[PDB]
Coordinates of C-alpha atoms in Angstrom, one line a residue:
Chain A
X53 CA 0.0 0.0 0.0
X54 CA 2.6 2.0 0.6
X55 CA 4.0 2.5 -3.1
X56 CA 0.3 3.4 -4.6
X57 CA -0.5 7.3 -5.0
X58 CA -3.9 6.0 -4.4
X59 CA -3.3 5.2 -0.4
X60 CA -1.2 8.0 -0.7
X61 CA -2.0 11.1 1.9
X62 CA -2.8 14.4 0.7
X63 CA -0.8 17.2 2.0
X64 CA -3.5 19.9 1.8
X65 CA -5.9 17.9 3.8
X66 CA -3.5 16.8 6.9
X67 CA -6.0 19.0 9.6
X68 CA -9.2 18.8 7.4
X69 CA -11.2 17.2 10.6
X70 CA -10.3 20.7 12.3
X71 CA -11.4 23.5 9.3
X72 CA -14.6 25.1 9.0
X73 CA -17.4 23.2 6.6
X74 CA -16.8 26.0 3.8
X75 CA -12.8 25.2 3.9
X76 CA -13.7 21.3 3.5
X77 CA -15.7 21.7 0.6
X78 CA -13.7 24.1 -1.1
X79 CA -10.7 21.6 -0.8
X80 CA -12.6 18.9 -2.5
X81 CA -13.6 21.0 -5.2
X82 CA -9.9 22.6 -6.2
X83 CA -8.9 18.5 -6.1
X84 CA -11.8 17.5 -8.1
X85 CA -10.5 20.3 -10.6
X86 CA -8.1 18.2 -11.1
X87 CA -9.9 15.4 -12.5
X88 CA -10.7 16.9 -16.0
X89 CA -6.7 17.5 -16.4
X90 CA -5.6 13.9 -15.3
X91 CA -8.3 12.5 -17.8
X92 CA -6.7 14.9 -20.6
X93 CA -3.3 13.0 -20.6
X94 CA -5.1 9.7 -21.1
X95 CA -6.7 11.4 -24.4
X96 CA -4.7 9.2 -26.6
X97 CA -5.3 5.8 -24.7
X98 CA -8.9 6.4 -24.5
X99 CA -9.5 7.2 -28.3
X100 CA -7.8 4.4 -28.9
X101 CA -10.0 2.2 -26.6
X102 CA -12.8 3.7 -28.5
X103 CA -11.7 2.9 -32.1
X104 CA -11.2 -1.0 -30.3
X105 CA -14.5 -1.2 -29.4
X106 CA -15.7 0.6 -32.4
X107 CA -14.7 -2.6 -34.4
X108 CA -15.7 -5.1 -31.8
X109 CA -18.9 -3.7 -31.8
X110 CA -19.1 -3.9 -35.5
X111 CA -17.7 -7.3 -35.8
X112 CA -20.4 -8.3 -33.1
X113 CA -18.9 -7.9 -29.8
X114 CA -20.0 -6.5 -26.4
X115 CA -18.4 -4.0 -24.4
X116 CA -18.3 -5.7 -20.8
X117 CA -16.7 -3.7 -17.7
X118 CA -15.9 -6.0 -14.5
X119 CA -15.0 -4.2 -11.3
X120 CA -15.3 -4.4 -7.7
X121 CA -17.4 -2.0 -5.1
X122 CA -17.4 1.9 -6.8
X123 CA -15.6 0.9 -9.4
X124 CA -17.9 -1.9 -10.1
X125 CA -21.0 0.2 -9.6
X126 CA -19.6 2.9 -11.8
X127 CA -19.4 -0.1 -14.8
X128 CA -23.0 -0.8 -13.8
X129 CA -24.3 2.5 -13.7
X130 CA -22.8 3.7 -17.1
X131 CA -24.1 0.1 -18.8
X132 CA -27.6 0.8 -18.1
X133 CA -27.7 4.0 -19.9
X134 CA -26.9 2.8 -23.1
X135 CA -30.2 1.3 -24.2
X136 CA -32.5 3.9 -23.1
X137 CA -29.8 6.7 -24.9
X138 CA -28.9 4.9 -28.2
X139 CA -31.6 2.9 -28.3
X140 CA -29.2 -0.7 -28.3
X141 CA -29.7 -4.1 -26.8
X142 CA -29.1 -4.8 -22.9
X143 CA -26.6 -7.1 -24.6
X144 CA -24.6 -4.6 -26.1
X145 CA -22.5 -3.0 -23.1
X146 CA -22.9 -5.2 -19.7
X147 CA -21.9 -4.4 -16.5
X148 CA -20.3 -6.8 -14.3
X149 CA -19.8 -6.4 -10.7
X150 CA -17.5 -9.1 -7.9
X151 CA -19.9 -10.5 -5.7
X152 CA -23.4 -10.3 -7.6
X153 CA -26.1 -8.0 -7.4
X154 CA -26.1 -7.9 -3.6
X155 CA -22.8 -5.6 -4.6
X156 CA -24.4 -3.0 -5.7
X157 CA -25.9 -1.8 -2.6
X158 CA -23.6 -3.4 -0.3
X159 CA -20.2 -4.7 -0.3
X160 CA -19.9 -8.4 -0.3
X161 CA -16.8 -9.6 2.2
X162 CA -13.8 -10.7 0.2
X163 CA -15.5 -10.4 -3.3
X164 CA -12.9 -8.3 -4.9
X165 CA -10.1 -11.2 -3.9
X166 CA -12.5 -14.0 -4.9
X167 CA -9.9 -14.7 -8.5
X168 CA -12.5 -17.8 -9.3
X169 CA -15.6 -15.9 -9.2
X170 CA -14.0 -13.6 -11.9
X171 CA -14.3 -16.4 -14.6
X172 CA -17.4 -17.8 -13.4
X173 CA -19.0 -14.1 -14.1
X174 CA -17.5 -13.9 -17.6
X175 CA -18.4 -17.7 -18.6
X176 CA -22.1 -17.0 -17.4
X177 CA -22.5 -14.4 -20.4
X178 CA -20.2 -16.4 -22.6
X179 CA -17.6 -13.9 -22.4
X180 CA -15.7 -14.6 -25.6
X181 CA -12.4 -13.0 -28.1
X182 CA -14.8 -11.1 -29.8
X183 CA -16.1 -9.2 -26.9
X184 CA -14.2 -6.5 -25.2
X185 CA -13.3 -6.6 -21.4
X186 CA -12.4 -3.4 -19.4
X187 CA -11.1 -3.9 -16.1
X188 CA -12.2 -1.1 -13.5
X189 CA -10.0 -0.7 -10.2
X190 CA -8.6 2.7 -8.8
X191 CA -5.9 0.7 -6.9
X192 CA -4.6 -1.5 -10.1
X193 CA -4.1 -4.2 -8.4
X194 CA -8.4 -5.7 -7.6
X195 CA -7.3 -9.0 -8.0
X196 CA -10.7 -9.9 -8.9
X197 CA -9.9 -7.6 -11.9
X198 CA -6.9 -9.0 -12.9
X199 CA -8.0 -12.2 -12.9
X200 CA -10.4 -11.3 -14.7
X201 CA -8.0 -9.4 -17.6
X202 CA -6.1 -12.1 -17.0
X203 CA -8.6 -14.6 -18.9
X204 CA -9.6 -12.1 -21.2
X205 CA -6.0 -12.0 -22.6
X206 CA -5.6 -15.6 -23.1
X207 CA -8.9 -15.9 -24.7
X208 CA -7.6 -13.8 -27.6
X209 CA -10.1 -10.5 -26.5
X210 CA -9.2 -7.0 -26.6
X211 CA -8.7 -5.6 -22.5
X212 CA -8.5 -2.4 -21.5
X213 CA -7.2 -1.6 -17.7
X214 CA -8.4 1.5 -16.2
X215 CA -7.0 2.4 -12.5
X216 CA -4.9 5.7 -10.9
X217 CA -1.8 3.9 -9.8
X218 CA 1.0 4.1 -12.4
X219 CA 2.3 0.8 -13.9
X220 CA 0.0 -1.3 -12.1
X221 CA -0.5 -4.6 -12.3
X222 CA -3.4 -4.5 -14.2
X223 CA -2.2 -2.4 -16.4
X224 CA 1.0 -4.7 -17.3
X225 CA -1.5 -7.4 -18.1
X226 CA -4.2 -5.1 -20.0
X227 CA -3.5 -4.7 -24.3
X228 CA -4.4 -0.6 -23.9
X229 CA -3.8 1.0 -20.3
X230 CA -5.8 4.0 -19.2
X231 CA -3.9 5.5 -16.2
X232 CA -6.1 8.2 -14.7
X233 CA -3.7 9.9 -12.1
X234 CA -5.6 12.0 -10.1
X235 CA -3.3 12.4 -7.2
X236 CA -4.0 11.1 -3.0
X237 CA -7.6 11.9 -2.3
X238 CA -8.9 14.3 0.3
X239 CA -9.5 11.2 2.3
X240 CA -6.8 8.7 2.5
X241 CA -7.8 5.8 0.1
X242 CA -11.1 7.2 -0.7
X243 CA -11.1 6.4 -4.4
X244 CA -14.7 6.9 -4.5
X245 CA -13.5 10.6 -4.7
X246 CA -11.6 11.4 -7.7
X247 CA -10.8 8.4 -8.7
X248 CA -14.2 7.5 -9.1
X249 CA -15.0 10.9 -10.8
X250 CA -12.0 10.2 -13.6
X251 CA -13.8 6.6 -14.0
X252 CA -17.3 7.4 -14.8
X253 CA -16.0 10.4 -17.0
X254 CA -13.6 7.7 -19.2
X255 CA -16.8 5.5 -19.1
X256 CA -19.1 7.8 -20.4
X257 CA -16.1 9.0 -23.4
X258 CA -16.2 5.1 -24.2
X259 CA -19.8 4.2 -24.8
X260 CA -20.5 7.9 -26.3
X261 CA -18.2 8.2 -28.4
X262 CA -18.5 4.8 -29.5
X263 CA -22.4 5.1 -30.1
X264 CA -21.4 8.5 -31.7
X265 CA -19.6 6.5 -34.5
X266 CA -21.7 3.8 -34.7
X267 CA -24.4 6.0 -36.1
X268 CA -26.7 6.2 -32.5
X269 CA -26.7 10.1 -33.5
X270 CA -27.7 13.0 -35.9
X271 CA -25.7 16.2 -35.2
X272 CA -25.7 16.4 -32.2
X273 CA -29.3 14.9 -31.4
X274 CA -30.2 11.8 -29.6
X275 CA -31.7 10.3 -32.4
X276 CA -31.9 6.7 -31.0
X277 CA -33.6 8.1 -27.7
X278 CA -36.0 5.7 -26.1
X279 CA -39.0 7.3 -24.4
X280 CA -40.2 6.1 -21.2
X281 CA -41.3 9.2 -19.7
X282 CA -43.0 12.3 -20.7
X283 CA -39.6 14.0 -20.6
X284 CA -38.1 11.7 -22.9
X285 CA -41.5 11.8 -25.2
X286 CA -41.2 15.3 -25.3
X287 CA -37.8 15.3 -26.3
X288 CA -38.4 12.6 -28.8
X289 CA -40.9 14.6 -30.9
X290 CA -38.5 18.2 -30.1
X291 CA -35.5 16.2 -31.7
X292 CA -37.3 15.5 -35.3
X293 CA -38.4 19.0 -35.4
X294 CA -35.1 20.1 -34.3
X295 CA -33.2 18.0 -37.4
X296 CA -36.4 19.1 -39.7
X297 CA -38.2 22.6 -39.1
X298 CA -41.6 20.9 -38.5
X299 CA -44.0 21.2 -35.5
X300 CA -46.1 19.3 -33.4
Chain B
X1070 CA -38.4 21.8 -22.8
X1071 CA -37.1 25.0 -24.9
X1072 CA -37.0 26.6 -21.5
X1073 CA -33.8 24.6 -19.8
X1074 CA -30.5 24.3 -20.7
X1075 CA -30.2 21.1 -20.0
X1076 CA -32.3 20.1 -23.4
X1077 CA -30.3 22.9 -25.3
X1078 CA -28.1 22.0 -27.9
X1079 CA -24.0 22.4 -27.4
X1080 CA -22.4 24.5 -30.3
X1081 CA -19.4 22.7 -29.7
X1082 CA -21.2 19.4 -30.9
X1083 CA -23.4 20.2 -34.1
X1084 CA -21.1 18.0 -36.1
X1085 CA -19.9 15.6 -33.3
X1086 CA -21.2 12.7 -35.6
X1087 CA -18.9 13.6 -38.2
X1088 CA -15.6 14.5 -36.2
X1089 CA -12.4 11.8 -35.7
X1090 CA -12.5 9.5 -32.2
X1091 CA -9.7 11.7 -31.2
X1092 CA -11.8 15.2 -31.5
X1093 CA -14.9 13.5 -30.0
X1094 CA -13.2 12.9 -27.1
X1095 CA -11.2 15.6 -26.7
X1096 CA -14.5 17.9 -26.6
X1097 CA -15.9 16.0 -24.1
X1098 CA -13.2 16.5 -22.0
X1099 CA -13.0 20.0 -22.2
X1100 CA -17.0 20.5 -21.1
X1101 CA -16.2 18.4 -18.5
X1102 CA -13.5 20.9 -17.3
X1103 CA -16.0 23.2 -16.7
X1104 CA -18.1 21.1 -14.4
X1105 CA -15.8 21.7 -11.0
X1106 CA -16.3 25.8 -12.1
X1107 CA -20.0 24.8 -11.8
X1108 CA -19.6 23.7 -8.9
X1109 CA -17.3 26.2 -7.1
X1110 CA -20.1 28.9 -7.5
X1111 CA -22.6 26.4 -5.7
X1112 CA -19.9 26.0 -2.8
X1113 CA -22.0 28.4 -0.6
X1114 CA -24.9 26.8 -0.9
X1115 CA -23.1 22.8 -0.8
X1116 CA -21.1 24.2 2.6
X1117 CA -24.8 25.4 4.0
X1118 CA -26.3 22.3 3.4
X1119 CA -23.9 20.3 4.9
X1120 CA -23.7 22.5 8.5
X1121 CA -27.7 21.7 8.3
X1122 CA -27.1 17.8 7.7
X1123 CA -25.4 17.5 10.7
X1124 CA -27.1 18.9 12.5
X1125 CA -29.9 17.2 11.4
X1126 CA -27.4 14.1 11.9
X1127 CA -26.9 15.0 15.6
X1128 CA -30.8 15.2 16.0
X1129 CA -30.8 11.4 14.7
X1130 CA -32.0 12.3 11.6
X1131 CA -31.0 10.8 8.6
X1132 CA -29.8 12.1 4.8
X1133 CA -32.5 10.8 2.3
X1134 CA -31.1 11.0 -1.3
X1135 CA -34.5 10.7 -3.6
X1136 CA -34.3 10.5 -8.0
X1137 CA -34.9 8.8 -11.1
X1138 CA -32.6 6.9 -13.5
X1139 CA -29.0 8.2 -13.6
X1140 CA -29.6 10.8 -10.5
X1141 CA -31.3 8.1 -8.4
X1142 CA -28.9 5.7 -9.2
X1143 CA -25.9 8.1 -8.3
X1144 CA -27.7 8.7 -4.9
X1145 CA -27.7 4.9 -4.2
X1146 CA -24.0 5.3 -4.8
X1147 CA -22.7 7.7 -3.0
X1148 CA -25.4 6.0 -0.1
X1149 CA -23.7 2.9 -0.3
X1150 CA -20.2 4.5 0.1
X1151 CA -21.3 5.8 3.4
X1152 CA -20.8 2.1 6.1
X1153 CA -17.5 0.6 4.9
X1154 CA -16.2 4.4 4.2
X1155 CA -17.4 6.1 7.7
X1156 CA -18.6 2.9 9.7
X1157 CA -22.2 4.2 10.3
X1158 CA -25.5 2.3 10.2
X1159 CA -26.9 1.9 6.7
X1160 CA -30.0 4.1 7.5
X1161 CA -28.0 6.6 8.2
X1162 CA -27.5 7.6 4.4
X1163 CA -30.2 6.4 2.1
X1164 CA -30.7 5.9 -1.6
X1165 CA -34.1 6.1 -2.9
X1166 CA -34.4 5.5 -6.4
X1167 CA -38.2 6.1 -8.3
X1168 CA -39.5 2.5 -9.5
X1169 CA -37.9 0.2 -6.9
X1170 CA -35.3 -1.8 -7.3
X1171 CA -35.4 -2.7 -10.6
X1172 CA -34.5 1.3 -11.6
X1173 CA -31.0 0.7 -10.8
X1174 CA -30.1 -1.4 -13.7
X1175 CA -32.8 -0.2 -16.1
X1176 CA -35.5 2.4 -16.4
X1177 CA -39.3 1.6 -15.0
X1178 CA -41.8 3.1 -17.8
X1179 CA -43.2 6.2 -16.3
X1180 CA -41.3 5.5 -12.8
X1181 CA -40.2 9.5 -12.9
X1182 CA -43.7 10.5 -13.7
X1183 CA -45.5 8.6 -10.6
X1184 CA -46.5 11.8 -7.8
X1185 CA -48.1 8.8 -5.6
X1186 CA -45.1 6.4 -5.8
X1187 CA -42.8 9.2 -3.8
X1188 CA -45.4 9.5 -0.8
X1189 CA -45.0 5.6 -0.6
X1190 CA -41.4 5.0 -0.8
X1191 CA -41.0 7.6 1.7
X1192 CA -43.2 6.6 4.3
X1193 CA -42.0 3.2 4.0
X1194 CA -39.1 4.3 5.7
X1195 CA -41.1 6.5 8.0
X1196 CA -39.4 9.8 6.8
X1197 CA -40.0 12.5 9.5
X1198 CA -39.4 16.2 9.8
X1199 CA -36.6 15.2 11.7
X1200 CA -34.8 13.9 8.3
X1201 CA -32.9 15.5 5.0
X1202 CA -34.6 15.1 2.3
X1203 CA -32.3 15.5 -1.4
X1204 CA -34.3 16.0 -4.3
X1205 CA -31.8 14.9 -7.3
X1206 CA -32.9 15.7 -10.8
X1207 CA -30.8 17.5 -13.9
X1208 CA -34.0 18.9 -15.3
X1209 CA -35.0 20.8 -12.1
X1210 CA -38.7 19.5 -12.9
X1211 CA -39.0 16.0 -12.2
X1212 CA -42.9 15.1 -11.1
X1213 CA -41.6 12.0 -8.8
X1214 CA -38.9 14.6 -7.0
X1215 CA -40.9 17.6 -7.5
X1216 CA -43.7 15.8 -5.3
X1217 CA -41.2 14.1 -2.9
X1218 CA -39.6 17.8 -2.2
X1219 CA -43.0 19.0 -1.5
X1220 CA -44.0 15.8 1.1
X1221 CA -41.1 16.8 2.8
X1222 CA -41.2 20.2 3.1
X1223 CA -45.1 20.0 4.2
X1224 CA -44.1 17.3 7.0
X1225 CA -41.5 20.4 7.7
X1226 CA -38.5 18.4 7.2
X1227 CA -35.5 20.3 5.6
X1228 CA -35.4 19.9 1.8
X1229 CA -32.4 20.6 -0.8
X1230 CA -32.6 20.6 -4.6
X1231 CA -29.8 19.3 -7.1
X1232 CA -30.7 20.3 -10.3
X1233 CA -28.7 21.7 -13.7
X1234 CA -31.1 24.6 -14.5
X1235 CA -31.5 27.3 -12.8
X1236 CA -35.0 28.6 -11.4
X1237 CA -36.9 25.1 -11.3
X1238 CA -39.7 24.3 -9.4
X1239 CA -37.2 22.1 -7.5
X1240 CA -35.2 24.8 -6.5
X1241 CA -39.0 27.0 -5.6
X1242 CA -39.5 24.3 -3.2
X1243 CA -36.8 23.5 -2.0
X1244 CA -35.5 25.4 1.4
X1245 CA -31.8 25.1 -0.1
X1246 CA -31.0 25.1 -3.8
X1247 CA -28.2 24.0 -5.3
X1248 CA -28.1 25.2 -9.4
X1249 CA -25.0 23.4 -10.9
X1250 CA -25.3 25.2 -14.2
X1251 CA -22.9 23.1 -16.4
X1252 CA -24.2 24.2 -19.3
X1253 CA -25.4 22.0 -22.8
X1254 CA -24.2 18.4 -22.9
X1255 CA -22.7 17.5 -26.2
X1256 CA -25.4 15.2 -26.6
X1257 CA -28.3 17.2 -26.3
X1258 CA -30.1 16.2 -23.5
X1259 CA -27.2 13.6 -22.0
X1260 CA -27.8 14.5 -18.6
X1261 CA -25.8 11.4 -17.6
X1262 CA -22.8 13.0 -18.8
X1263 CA -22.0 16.7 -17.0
X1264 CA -25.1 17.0 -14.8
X1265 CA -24.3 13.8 -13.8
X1266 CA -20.8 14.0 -12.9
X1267 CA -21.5 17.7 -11.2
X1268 CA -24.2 15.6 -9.5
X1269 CA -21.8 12.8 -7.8
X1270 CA -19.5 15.8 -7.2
X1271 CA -21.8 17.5 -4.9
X1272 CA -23.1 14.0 -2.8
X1273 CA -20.2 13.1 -2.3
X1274 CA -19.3 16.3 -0.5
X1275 CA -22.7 16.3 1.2
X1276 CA -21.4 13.0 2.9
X1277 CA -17.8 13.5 3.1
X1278 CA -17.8 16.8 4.8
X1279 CA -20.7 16.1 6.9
X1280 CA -18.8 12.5 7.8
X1281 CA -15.4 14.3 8.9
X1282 CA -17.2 17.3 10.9
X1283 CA -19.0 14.1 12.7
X1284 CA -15.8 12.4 13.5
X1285 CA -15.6 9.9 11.8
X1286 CA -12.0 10.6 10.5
X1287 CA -8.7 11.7 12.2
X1288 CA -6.4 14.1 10.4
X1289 CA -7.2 12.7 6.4
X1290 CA -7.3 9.1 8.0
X1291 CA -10.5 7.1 6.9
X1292 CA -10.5 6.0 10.9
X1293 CA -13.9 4.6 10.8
X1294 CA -13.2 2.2 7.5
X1295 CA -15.1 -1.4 7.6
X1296 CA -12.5 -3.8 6.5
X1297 CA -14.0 -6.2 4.2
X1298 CA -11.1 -7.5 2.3
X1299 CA -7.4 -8.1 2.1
X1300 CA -6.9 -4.3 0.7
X1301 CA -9.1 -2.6 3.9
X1302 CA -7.6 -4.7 6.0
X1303 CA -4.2 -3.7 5.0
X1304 CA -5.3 0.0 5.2
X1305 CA -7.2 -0.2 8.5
X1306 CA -3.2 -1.6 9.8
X1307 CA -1.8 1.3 8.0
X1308 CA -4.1 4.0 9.2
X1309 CA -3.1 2.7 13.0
X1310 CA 0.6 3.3 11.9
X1311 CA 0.1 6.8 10.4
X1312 CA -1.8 8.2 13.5
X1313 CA 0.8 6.7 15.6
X1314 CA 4.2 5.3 14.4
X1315 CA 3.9 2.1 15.5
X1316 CA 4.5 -1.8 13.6
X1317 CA 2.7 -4.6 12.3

């Protein structure tokens, strides 16, 4: 633990559980500034990813994210907003998280060291070469995750590492390494912080940029949009006046 | 829907579905630079509603997070965060997401529409005057939150608004209103993406900041963490040494 930035201390936050409530706040917003940069220096890596999953998708693969806790979560949450955005299958990006659906709400003791259940998961939705496998884990070094890339790899299918710790494990093991440093949180080891920011924003650059380029757009309009609201309906009939000057 | 930002189009993005993997990306990034900016104008208004959660907190009350799809799901995240982070009692933070479980993989046909729903997922868990309530919605205008805000604030609990455009009925109701204008997504009407981000940004300063002021930290050491695997448990050794230089 002691050679990860991620368990790392932050220096500006040493007496935080003695300043005022404005002081605390305003730390954790010049940190989460920080974010938005650390995500700009991984530019390259995650176009790339994107142009990867681009052709997977188009040669009939999934995009599946495995991860533990937040980081699993994350993979979950940004999953289940692909269907009802670009209109594709539940099929198409899946979320995996260690330990089941009782994970989501709660942790599950051990799950993220469980290296078996990793390939149990990925052999339950016949997890194959074709598909793509993105292994989520602040630290690098879930070894639920890196079993899990692990597999991937011998299979013969793209994998894609994304974690805040330089030259982690995961990454070593992972074909296209996304390495999101985003310094020691405001709370020691509290990657649901920052790190967990610089994960859902890398997340959300795969699957829309990906759906971008796959067509799942006009302009800039949700085209694909799949109403199941009055919102949504409402923005469903705005969006074909918006491409053509029609009306209601 | 002409009337909110949030369904406005980006000018950035007009021919996003024509631009390289590269550029796609690279614009994304650079809105979401501008979400902490959002954010550090709401800091008055975050730090105010923290000071009243702990209170509330100290009276036995508890934070209630309430939203639909992405923003109800982001509540049940940062809600689940809150035990093995700070060591407190699951009620203490809660997630409540509109359509029941189900919601947090995929969306409940007219779940965000449903004014009686609210009224019955709150009183389930017997929310009192004595309780937060967090009404989480990008538009500003969600009926399920919009009616959940107004419960609460009848039953004179304190209420606070999280919403992307400025001058909702959210924000009219609510007794503390945080307006996290980050401006057009570059998919029109993405809310998952910036309003979404800017959204974790803020819970998880609601709980962290209220969490330290309540002790549960020492210094910018996560004091109170539940170990439940090798990586906690590691830390939770650690944590012991940093505070005091002792050994394993």
């Amino acid at each position: 633990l002691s050679t990860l930035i991620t368990e790392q201390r932050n220096p500006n936050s040493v007496d935080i559980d003695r300043q005022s409530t404005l002081e605390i706040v305003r730390l954790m917003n010049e940190e989460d500034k920080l974010v938005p940069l650390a995500i700009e220096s991984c530019l390259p890596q995650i176009s790339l990813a994107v142009e990867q999953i681009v052709q997977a998708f188009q040669q009939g693969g999934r995009l599946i994210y495995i991860g533990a806790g937040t980081s699993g979560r994350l993979g979950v949450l940004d999953a289940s907003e692909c269907p009802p955005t670009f209109g594709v299958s539940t099929e198409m990006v899946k979320g995996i998280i260690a330990g089941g659906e009782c994970a989501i709400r709660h942790p599950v003791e051990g799950a993220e060291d469980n290296t078996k259940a990793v390939l149990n998961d990925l052999q339950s939705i016949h997890f194959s070469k074709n598909d793509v496998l993105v292994g989520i884990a602040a630290s690098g070094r879930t070894p639920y995750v890196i079993a899990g890339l692990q597999y991937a790899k011998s299979l013969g299918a793209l994998t894609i590492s994304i974690a805040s710790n330089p030259k982690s494990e995961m990454a070593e093991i992972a074909d296209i390494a996304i390495e999101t440093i985003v310094g020691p949180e405001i709370l020691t080891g509290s990657s649901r912080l920052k790190s967990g920011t610089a994960q859902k924003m890398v997340l959300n650059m795969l699957t829309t940029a990906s759906m971008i380029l796959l067509g799942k757009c006009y302009e800039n309009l949700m085209v694909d949009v799949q109403a199941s609201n009055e919102k949504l309906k409402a923005r469903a009939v705005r969006i074909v006046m918006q491409a053509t000057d029609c009306n209601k």
